[PDB]
Design a protein around this ligand. Structure first.
Ligand SMILES: [Mn+2]
Ligand SMILES: [Mn+2]
Lengths: 379, 372
């Protein structure tokens, strides 16, 4: 009954929330491994002290002078922790490139993968799916968790549409003209990291929703032309599934990542008291509006990339990272971000092939960066 | 996998929509029987002509079944997989029991069966045999797929709030039957409309919910949702709510009741998110509309108390329609009858035990009417 959990990226937002859910539910979960990059060593050490878990990994080569009591350390150490630790669930909340090999390792162990890391599916794609058995991956993100729950409303042949909700970001309802000269700061990003501005900038450009559409396709096997995005400013409905009979099933809760985190850890079993429910004691409104796809072409571009397949979604994301960096630096305008992604994709016919290995993913990403760098330098 | 369907109450709203669903899906369904009250004999004979079904009951030339218990007789003697009981009022109870005895799936629309029949109908049913047709119950059934029973925290029924949403008790004192949507100048039995205005319909659905899904009354909530796009919701122990949403259209829950657990392709239009929309939620004013709490009170007391609740409603509601009492007195009389109904908390053993409760309620309600 007590699930053994390995928590990768333990020091970030998702990881720390996951450890709180586990601490609150010692009957259901036992932490048996922790991993984080060397920059976060001090937090990781506090976590070892707090949890009593000595099976911990420094996930990269960094903090090298301060490791000597640490069982795993070095570039791919999180992967080794996964390979060597008996577990029922691996929560992969590592950020970016670091997440891919541990994902593949976790799947190979036969454990459930509670997946938070977007790169695994967006860049890894069929590499990750190739390694997974049906139902082995349980998504952690709010939208995908909603979809997984909503799909309980019918059999796979009964699914008509997956409908992802989107907040619409800070520029919801802005015209193309209004968006021409917006600054990084107006997009909610404050160019002093190129780290936290990334997730935030992706929310403004609607690239994050593009990525979520890609993940949806890979997680659930629904064609891109049956994955819709609908703007829902309250973010209370987290996503919905429309069935062939006309019924839609939706999942709703006040925003709180502890809900989807808990469900990913305990799947298929719900965790009592994970998060507050919607309170109908008070009057409220749930609003829906269509996405403006002329103004926000990032989502359709993700569908185009996803339809092409193979390493194309890795190219989409890597071109975005580069173009986003350029906008944050003041080098290009806001609308040029998705323009650059489209131009790189146009040139990326060689990257439709399925990756044989991780190296092919890495090669596609390298190529996309150089290509986006070229596009940026040209304007 | 073609299902044989008996349609009871075929000439009303639910029956005609069901026949259309069946006509559109001959590979899934086949009509094998029709039953109607006789008032709409014109429709029924029109339905005979179009369906081919001669196996018909009038609940009268060469009609195989006619009389008071004709629908019950039709059910007992027709081989079917599904019985759709869309009869209204007292008419639906014996055919429900007869349908359950056959072992066929009962696609239940008739509110009388559970509200009045109660434990008597539940004891005649195997678990899973009754599939609800009402939009709220269909939605709850779908949303319950969101977890195991031990994970259910609350059932949340949505309610339009009716025409008097936002009104005061004082506002209600001077409403016409006309104003309440139940036109007494041409009435054919406008109980559902009046019940929507008084919130008694919601009270009846709360009782039905408890009996269908075995969830305690203190965990069945009602929220007002004017759009009627979300048809009901389930909140689970982790704080997740699963909702069922669709543009209002009874063909959706009808199709699913007939084909349970399999969905019927193209039954109804889906929510269209190409155009902007708002789904509003507001609390029910339980001071002005205590009919739902009264239903919970009666449901908790149990036994024949829910049959008393509904029969007292009908009698008070008939009196309002005649211009004999005011609007707020409908639910006032229900409460008055319930307060004196101490005796009826005993479980019914026979149909006549229920009819006795109903007669008692009707009679006691009359005395309150002649008093008010
Ligand atoms: Mn998300
Ligand atoms: Mn209803």
């Amino acid at each position: 009954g007590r699930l053994r959990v390995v928590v990768l990226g333990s020091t970030g937002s998702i990881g720390t929330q996951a450890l709180q859910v586990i601490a609150d539910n010692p009957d259901r979960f036992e932490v048996v491994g922790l991993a984080a990059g060397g920059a976060h060593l001090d937090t990781l050490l506090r976590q070892r002290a707090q949890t009593g878990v000595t099976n911990i990994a420094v996930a990269d080569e960094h903090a090298a002078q301060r490791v000597g009591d640490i069982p795993y350390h070095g570039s791919d150490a999180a992967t080794r922790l996964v390979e060597q630790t008996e577990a029922d669930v691996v929560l992969n909340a590592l950020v970016g490139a670091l997440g891919l090999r541990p994902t593949l390792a976790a799947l190979k162990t036969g454990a459930r993968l509670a997946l938070a890391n977007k790169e695994s599916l967006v860049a890894g794609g069929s590499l990750v799916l190739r390694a997974a058995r049906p139902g082995q991956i349980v998504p952690v993100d709010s939208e995908h968790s909603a979809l997984a729950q909503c799909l309980r409303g019918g059999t796979p042949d009964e699914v008509a549409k997956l409908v992802l909700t989107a907040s619409g970001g800070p520029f919801r309802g802005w015209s193309a003209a209004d968006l021409e000269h917006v600054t990084p700061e107006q997009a909610g990003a404050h160019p002093t990291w190129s780290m936290g501005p990334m997730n935030t900038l992706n929310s403004a450009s609607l690239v994050n929703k593009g990525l979520e559409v890609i993940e949806t396709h890979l997680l659930f096997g629904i064609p891109y032309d049956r994955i819709d995005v609908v703007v829902h400013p309250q973010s209370i409905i987290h996503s919905m599934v429309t069935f062939i009979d006309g019924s839609t099933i939706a999942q709703a809760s006040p925003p709180d990542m502890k809900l989807p985190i808990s469900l990913a850890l305990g799947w298929p079993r719900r965790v009592s008291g994970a998060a507050a429910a919607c309170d109908f004691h008070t009057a409220s409104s749930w609003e829906f509006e269509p996405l403006d796809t002329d103004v926000f072409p990032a989502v359709e571009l993700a569908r185009q990339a996803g339809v092409a397949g193979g390493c194309m979604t890795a190219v989409y994301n890597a071109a975005n990272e580069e173009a986003a960096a350029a906008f944050l630096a003041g080098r290009i305008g806001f609308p040029a971000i998705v323009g650059i992604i489209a131009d790189v994709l146009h040139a990326a016919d060689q990257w439709a092939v399925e990756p044989a290995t991780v190296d092919d993913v890495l090669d596609a990403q390298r190529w996309a960066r150089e290509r986006a760098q070229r596009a940026v330098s040209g304007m």
